[PDB]
Ligand binder design. Structure first.
Ligand SMILES: Cc1cn([C@H]2C[C@H](O)[C@@H](COP(=O)(O)OP(=O)(O)OP(=O)(O)O)O2)c(=O)[nH]c1=O
Ligand SMILES: Nc1ncnc2c1ncn2[C@H]1C[C@H](O)[C@@H](COP(=O)(O)OP(=O)(O)O)O1
Ligand SMILES: [Mg+2]
Lengths: 357, 109, 357
């Protein structure tokens, strides 16, 4: 079963990323994969608090927005609050019982903590642009266009948590639980972990970046600029997050960490492809809901759907998946601002005479 | 990098520095007292150890240290520093704690 | 089972601290208990990094220490590395699947995150005073004098984690798992949560404060002052941590949050007393190992054991437990410094004649 401090003295450098011996002593002088140690130092260096950003002017801009632009902005904010609500708790609940090297354990905890700062900043933004924040928060759980993807995203986490609990309680093998037969396969647990990380990669590298386009499109019009500063800080963290999941996925896929994992990654390549395609298709439908009542300067259904295809191809190639959409140039190049970062008068008559006209 | 320092006893002889001797003396003097601290006296002594340090200079320093802790909140330090000083005066005059017989002393004096 | 985003739209202000509906939407505009929101804001404001502390002089001081004072310092450092190693992961693993209000969920993640900075600072201190840190870290798991105390603390976490897995997989009731009968009692689960929180309170409010005395005793002699600067920042965090466990325990014990919990607290009152007293005796035992090779100016076995009994009475009274040791004045009063932030020449002859000699 899971232990918070395993008694065995293991060489933490030879453990795998997941399913090895639970981490005991937390040391940071050495790493098996130093990508996670760098992600920790970089996330610690980015530490910000929401209240340090002035969002008071954003209230005036919001009230002046057209009715359908209030809708576009506030719907993207509820979806953001939702996704980072899941991201606040889920990496800690789903990954900590599986991690077996210290540098990856601490990164996941730092990753999750930094997400709670995002959740706090959404509360900060909401309470500074609307009159009753309860109106926005109460709509997040019941919203038709949100709850479809909320339960879809949480399921990959939930199913991984469930199999992890059986694996700790019962161990591998064929078991009987209240008459019914229950099979606990570590290979099927490694499969749920891989599929979950793929879903999280699509969540943070595609779903959120579609949201960044909406938040920053208002900022290119010098509107909602306090929100833009916070979303810009969130985007800087979000690049660190997806890099972590990219390195996890590629280390698992390449068999560097677990020889068994290389085959499991290949048996999932079709599910992972359909997973990303589904996510991309869901955001295009979400884009269809945003502009249901009209568009704004710089952003409509076509533009946002084009960015969906653009950002999706980039992310999927980063994890070794086939590109599902046509090749395309960046439809919103302006988004990159927010995501990255006399005379020498002497003569020589001799040298001139050395010349025939 | 242990140096193994030496202290000079009252009879001129030397031995390895042993802090438990200081612990016992202070614990003896603070017995029965309220709101005193052996730890406070030792740290406030700022006692500078050098090889060959006189044992009388060590004791005279912790007397001053406990004497300066006499306060309204910790009044019983008046008795801690007194017992350290009475102990010091016994050694200075007799070489031990227990005083000689009344007759033997008058004869010598 | 546990879900990372529960579908039900519930009034989070009316949920209990634990075992209620798993938190869905993360909001911070309102709290049921604002103590945890204040603890979050206070922990975020204390955010510090180990590298911002100058520890260069500490390497010279350490090498110059007597051989047995090297023992005291490095043994207290290994024990610290151990305790905050558990504390890095354990509140996230053992409490997150049980919390049902958002302000407590985010505090536990902030609490756990701040512990990883402690774990990193221990690596920072170690790698700046010894030549091969691997010698120090490898002794934490194998040295027989340390790991004995590790399993005492980790067990309360492990047993709570296990029952939580059964409670999510099987639910409450009498079950059969591989023939053998398995009973899942929520009342016995609330009992394991309460006992675990009691163990953590003794860990952070007694065990660590005994360790603080050693680090600061070197600093009262102007030695190891870089370590002392870091331990002082850690102590400021640890004061927030024990405040969290105290408020949880007292809210549970008074039945204010869960009426059923009030009686469960009374059925544990004896176990919790023995739990705290045991911790004090274990730390008193640890002190005997520190000074097995000699003492130092201002600190020996008796002084530190007196502080153990002194601080234990205070902590146990704070959570409604009987005092197990005699009343005592603070044996190390210096520790409180580190655990908190002419003549008027005119005459009147006529007035003088109005006087009878
Ligand atoms: C006077 C007195 C002292 N003491 C304590 C105070 C001293 O620490 C110790 C007596 O001091 P000493 O007999 O001088 O012992 P010491 O530890 O200095 O060793 P030595 O001189 O042989 O190297 O006992 C008592 O316990 N009871 C008493 O009545
Ligand atoms: N080996 C040692 N190292 C350091 N200090 C010592 C010591 N032995 C004794 N002391 C301290 C404790 C007392 O406060 C002080 C006077 O002690 P003492 O018993 O009067 O002298 P001594 O033992 O030298 O005859 O010296
Ligand atoms: Mg003597």
């Amino acid at each position: 079963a899971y232990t918070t401090f395993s008694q065995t003295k293991n060489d933490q450098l030879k453990e795998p990323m997941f399913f090895g011996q639970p981490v005991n002593v937390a040391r940071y002088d050495q790493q098996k994969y130093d990508i996670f140690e760098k992600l920790i130092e970089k996330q610690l260096s980015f530490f910000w608090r929401p209240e340090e950003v002035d969002v008071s002017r954003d209230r005036i801009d919001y009230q002046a927005l057209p009715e359908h632009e209030k809708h576009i902005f506030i719907s993207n904010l509820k979806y953001q609050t939702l996704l980072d609500s899941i991201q606040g708790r889920s990496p800690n609940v789903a990954l900590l019982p599986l991690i077996s090297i210290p540098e990856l354990e601490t990164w996941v905890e730092t990753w999750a903590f930094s997400e709670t700062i995002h959740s706090r900043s959404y509360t900060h933004i909401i309470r500074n642009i609307v009159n009753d924040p309860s109106v926005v928060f109460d709509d997040i759980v019941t919203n038709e266009q949100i709850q479809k993807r909320a339960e879809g995203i949480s399921s990959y986490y939930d199913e991984l948590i469930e199999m992890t609990s059986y694996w700790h309680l019962l161990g591998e093998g064929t078991h009987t639980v209240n008459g019914k037969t229950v099979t606990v396969s570590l290979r099927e647990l490694k499969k749920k972990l891989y599929l979950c990380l793929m879903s999280v990669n699509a969540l943070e590298a595609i779903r959120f970046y579609v949201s960044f386009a909406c938040s920053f499109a208002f900022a290119e019009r010098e509107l909602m600029e306090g929100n833009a500063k916070i979303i810009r800080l969130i985007a800087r963290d979000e690049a660190l997050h997806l890099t972590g999941t990219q390195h996890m996925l590629n280390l698992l896929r390449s068999g560097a960490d677990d020889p068994e994992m290389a085959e499991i990654a290949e048996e999932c390549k079709q599910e992972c492809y359909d997973l990303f395609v589904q996510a991309a298709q869901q955001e295009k439908d979400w884009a269809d809901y945003l502009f249901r009542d009209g568009s704004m300067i710089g952003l409509n259904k076509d533009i946002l759907c084009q960015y969906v295809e653009y950002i999706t191809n980039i992310r999927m190639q980063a994890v070794g998946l086939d590109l599902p959409f046509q090749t395309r140039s960046n439809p919103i190049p302006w988004i990159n601002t927010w995501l990255v970062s006399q005379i020498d008068s002497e003569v020589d008559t001799d040298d001139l005479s050395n010349f025939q006209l | 990098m242990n140096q193994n320092l030496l202290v000079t006893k009252r009879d001129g002889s030397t031995e390895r520095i042993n802090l438990d001797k200081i612990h016992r003396v202070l614990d003896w003097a603070a017995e029965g007292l309220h709101n005193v601290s052996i730890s406070q006296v030792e740290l406030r002594s700022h006692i500078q150890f050098y090889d060959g340090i006189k044992t009388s200079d060590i004791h005279e320093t912790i007397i001053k240290a406990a004497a300066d802790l006499i306060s309204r909140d910790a009044p019983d330090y008046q008795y801690l520093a007194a017992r350290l000083a009475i102990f010091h005066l016994r050694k200075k005059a007799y070489g031990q704690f227990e005083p000689p017989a009344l007759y033997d002393h008058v004869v010598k004096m």
